[PDB]
Amino acid sequence: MPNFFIDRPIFAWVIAIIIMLAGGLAILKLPVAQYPTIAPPAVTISASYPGADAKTVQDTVTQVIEQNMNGIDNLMYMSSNSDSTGTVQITLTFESGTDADIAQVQVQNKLQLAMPLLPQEVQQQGVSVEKSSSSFLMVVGVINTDGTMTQEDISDYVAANMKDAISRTSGVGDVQLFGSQYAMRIWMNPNELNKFQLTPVDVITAIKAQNAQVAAGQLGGTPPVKGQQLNASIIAQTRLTSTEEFGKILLKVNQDGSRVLLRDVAKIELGGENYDIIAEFNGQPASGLGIKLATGANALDTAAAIRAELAKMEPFFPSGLKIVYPYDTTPFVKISIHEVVKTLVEAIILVFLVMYLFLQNFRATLIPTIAVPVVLLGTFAVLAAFGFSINTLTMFGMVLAIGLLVDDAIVVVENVERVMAEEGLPPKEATRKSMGQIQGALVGIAMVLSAVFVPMAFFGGSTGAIYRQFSITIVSAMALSVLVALILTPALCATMLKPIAKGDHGEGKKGFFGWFNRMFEKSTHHYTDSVGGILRSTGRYLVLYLIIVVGMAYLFVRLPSSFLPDEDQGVFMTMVQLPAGATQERTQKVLNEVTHYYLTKEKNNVESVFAVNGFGFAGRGQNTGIAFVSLKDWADRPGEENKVEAITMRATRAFSQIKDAMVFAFNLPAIVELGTATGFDFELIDQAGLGHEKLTQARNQLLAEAAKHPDMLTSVRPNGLEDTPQFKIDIDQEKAQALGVSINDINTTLGAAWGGSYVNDFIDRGRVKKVYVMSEAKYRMLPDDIGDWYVRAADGQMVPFSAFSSSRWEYGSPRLERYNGLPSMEILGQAAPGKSTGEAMELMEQLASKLPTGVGYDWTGMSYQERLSGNQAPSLYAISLIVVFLCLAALYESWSIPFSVMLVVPLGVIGALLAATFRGLTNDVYFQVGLLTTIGLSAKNAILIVEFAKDLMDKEGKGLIEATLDAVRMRLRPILMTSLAFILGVMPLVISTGAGSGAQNAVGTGVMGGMVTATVLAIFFVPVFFVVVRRRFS
Amino acid sequence: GAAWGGSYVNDFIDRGRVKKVYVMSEAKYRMLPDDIGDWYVRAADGQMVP
Amino acid sequence: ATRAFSQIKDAMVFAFNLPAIVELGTATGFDFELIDQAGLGHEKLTQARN
Ligand SMILES: NC1CCN(C[C@@H](O)COc2cccc(C(F)(F)F)c2)CC1
Secondary structure (H helix, E strand, O other), X not given: OHHHHHOOHHHHHHHHHHHHHHHHHHHHHOOEOOOOOOOOOEEEEEEEOXXXXXXXXXXXXXXXXXXXXXXXXXXXXXXXXXEOOOEEEEEEEEOOOOOHHHHHHHHHHHHHHHHHHOOHHHHHHOXXXXXXXXXXXXXXXXXXXXXXOOHHHHHHHHHHHHHHHHHHOOOEEEEEEEOOOEEEEEEEOHHHHHHOOOOHHHHHHHHHHHOOOOOOEEEOOOOOOOOOOOOEEEOOOXXXXXXXXXXXXXXXXXXXXXXXXXXXXXXXXXXXXXXXXEEEEOOEEEEEEEEEEOOOOEXXXXXXXXXXXXXXXXXXXXXXXXEEEEEOOHHHHHHHHHHHHHHHHHHHHHHHHHHHHHHOOHHHHHHHHHHHHHHHHHHHHHHHHOOOOEOHHHHHHHHHHHHHHHHHHHHHHHXXXXXXXXXXXXXXXXHHHHHHHHHHHHHHHHHHHHHHHHHHHHOOHHHHHHHHHHHHHHHHHHHHHHHHHXXXXXXXXHHHOOOOOOOOOOOOOOHHHHHHHHHHHHHHHHHHHHHHHHHHHHHHHHHHHHHHHHHHHHHHHHOOEOOOOOOOOOEEEEEEEOXXXXXXXXXXXXXXXXXXXXXXXXXXXXXXXXXXEEEOOOOEEEEEEEEEEEEOOHHHOOOHHHOHHHHHHHHHHHHOOOOOOEEEEEEOOOOOOOOOOOEEEEEEEEOOOOOHHHHHHHHHHHHHHHHOOOOXXXXXXXXXXXXXXXXXXXXXXXXXXXXXXXXXXXXXXXHHHHHOEEEEEEEEOOEEEEEEEEEOHHHOOXXXXXXXXXXXXXXXXXXXXXXXXXXXXXXXXXXXXXEOOEEEXXXXXXXXXXXXXXXXXXXXXXXXXXXXXXXXEEEOOHHHHHHHOOOHHHHHHHHHHHHHHHHHHHHHOOOOHHHHXXXXXXXXXXXXXXXXXXXXXXXXXXXXXHHHHHHHHHHHHHHHHHHHHHHHHHHOOOOHHHHHHHHHHHHHHHHHHHHHHHHHHHHHHHHOOOOOHHXXXXXXXXXXXXXXXXXXXXXXXXXXXXXXXXXXXX | OOOOOOEEEEEEEEOOEEEEEEEOXXXXXXXXXXXXXXXXXXXXXXXXXX | OOOHHHXXXXXXXXXXXXXXXXXXXXXXXXXXXXXXXXXXXXXXHHHHHO
């Protein structure tokens, strides 16, 4: 193939043009997102049963739905929570590769058949099935700076005017309203209700009767009379529209002739559907829209479109309404992608500079400057073809593959240059000879790097999905680089390079270039002499190689493991957890202290604080809250002390002094779609119907036992809420019957007054809005207020609740958990420093085995993935190693020579490990992919060295030592210049400290160390391996 | 609703097939707007209110 | 077993192995449907089947 395209440079140029056009089309049409789909597909069912405790929701909703989640394909597991707020939340997790649309449709279809079995109130509120495996692209908050609009007003305005147009913006996949539309609130007064001889049941009945849509008919409708000429539709009673209309609702007319309206026994207003959650932006009332990106959409373009739509909206807003962006991580994505692109461009420029320094030829330097961009564009085309997107993983994989790309280009051009400078042949004949020398090596290298990189695509789980991005990117880049080195680079060398004299290698030049040429010639002579001396005493260096291998193993075992570096994305979170029974006001006060601290003690770093009172993480209630702190631009936060880690540490230290509250500040995970660390998530299952109390006792026993092992298990805690006091109303139905009070009336009165009851809809400004009846807040606060509520009897006489019911205080769970349809309790923990996750999981299994009868356990979350993909690596790499050996044996036509090449892995691995250890970095994904890239480059260099040596030994009569020395002399320059180019290209990643510096350092430090030690060691260890192998096996 | 727009009550069986049952006014009593006064509703005391 | 289960005289008892593929059934068997396509009724369909 190289000879074919040397006579046909225009055909090679046509192929290159096709590749570039395909790459450009892909670049214009590729999606862009921070990360790809990593989490396994999950479908989440949400239902609300207002006014209900955890047990009521669990027994009436959660269990009924869970007993019908059958016949759904590809389900890994299922979990559910039932909260004291009246909400059930069921998550069904499916294996990776499952079609999320099909999983969702199956789940909702099974729920549609389960729907008739649920309470009528749950059916009225609706059960929603969504995809919870994704996260918010953006959060657009709406605030009022005048105080004229409360939170409900802002929420209703956003719902009516903003949600539709934002949803219609291009690329927007989903919009969730941080709030709700208006609701007709009927705040009942029990005293007035008793005065006018009424109860909440009467109010609901009247509202339902006098606010409804009635089908009337049609004038002159078919079948008509034989002479009808007019046909018109008849309109009749329609839904109410104004608070005044609801106030005029008639409940009863008294005997004396007075009229009792709804306004007489209650206040009528436009409130919110729910009041559980209060959102504030820097202390001001706020609503919001959470925008999820559509599938296949460009995140940057979608964010820009959203901002443009909001800017268009701005003029029409009511005075004092403003738009803010509390959670804007798109700037982080933009700066990260820009840094990667800049790294690629600077790498190409550095390749040009190194080529000019070493070869002092302008056209030779131009040749790689054409070759590498063609390969990159082809790689973009290949990513687009297989439905990949431009994300952090793929872009960093491209950064890593730059080393192999530049190595291929440098190898081809430098070999042609050397053939010209030694044999004195013209460019065309020299290119023919060079490619005849190196083409088989290039093909074998392509196969070997395929063997090295493909196995990562076959890892399982979220980690496997992460690794597949790098695998596909690097494999495509390597294959395209080899194809270019076989097609275009020979043609460019044959057509562009100028002739060089037989004996000219830059000695006669003057100045810095002449000095550099003389110095490099002397260094080559010295290195050749040193290698020749080394080959006389190979045993000592074999012992040294064993020492290096032992040190490599030591460093590998002593290096901690991780998944992804934690990044300073310009935002972080602060959870507030108050003691059981804390009300909304106490949590609001604590959140106010947190906001004050962030806006005063960190005013130079924090831009805004979005405090949400009503739900934290792992729960939702009046005692929980979460604040999303946004930081200023990184340019305005210089130094380590002003980054997210330092700010979070200082904030946690400051908040530790807060009393009667656990306030904890922390940073986002690398991929927010997964909450993952070097820890375990553990489920304790009630396998025999023991009950909640026995399961709590078993959990306490397990927690104590785990705490008795501080050396292996750290911070083993429950992921749930402890039992809290509850107010039990024990109704004596015998008394109710004796007093002529229907228990249905008693229960309806209690629920409507204290829990709130949804009655029906009404049309406000052309939109359906719910009508809620609830007791006015004054009369449903304390237990004594129970005495303010009366119920009519069959005799017409009111009876108080104290007359037919007693009260007391008990203990109950505010949050009931189920796993795989059985009662469960979740425990989070992490292995102690120096201990692997597997050891902690084994110890937890052992401790669980000593638990009461009928208590089982399971692993869920990341622990499930660990338990599936536990031993898959070493097998996948034993297959890779075998395939590499087979490819090398095919290439060299020898069963023993492959070992001389294969013995080079530790040379780069040791350097990568040392660089990671000194810098303190962990054994994370980026480090592992960089390690594989270093191994690939080292193997490529060793393959070329051994190929040259064996070619000299076979095609010429040169001996083993002479051939080895000549081969290393020939290969020294390309190795050194490629290593220099790649090291200088990755310097910015190593030294970076700004946005995205975590991933940059993780990628760059290992690459730097591995490349440095590989270049230093291989150049005199590969000859030793080759000589030893040929002596022992010949 | 039943008089002017028709009300579907329940199902019956015609020649072995399930079919609908509709109650509706005769055409002559639901053609003109003046026919509304021809329709009465029973009161709790038994009197027919137009 | 089938031969033995003929003196019972109380029920039809029939022991049988499964085919290689359950759905395919016996290579010489046929399944036939007599449809009531005119609303005849159950009794007339029974008479036709008889
Ligand atoms: N009825 C409404 C009342 C208002 N709030 C709004 C809060 O949910 C917004 O807070 C956020 C902000 C950003 C991200 C998230 C994430 F964690 F969900 F991703 C939550 C919800 C219920």
